[PDB]
Amino acid sequence: GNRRIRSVGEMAENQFRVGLVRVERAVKERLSLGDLDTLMPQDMINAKPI
Amino acid sequence: RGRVGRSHHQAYAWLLTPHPKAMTTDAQKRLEAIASLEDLGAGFALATHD
Numbered sequence: 001g002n003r004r005i006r007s008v009g010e011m012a013e014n015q016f017r018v019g020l021v022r023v024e025r026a027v028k029e030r031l032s033l034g035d036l037d038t039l040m041p042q043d044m045i046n047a048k049p050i
Numbered sequence: 051r052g053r054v055g056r057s058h059h060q061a062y063a064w065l066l067t068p069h070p071k072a073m074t075t076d077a078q079k080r081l082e083a084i085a086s087l088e089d090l091g092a093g094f095a096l097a098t099h100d
Contacts, residue, residue, distance in 0.1 A: 032072035 022049040051084070 027044045054061035067073050067081065087096060 029072055029074075032069050034068070 016050070019050045051088075 023045055026046060026049075030044050051063055054063060065081065065084075067077070070078070073081070083099065084096075087099075089095075
């Protein structure tokens with residue numbers, strides 16, 4: 001009752017979220033950088049941390 | 051900072067920056083570098099720091 005199965009979906013989802021925290025941080029940084037008027041969401045998000 | 055002043059009158063300087071976390075650490079440490087050393091005759095000190 002106190003021990004819990006953490007299977008492949010949950011561990012991979014946690015790792016993916018741990019990655020996603022980095023890329024939202026970078027997006028937040030560059031999005032807080034201004035002149036957003038001509039910008040597209042391929043250079044704010046970077047697939048390398050994910 | 052050099053072109054303001056040049057006179058008896060007090061010259062205010064305004065360093066508009068992004069948000070302090072949003073500014074990169076290079077820009078940050080440059081900013082408290084210039085902010086820590088506001089002195090008349092501090093240029094060669096800044097050049098030696100460069």
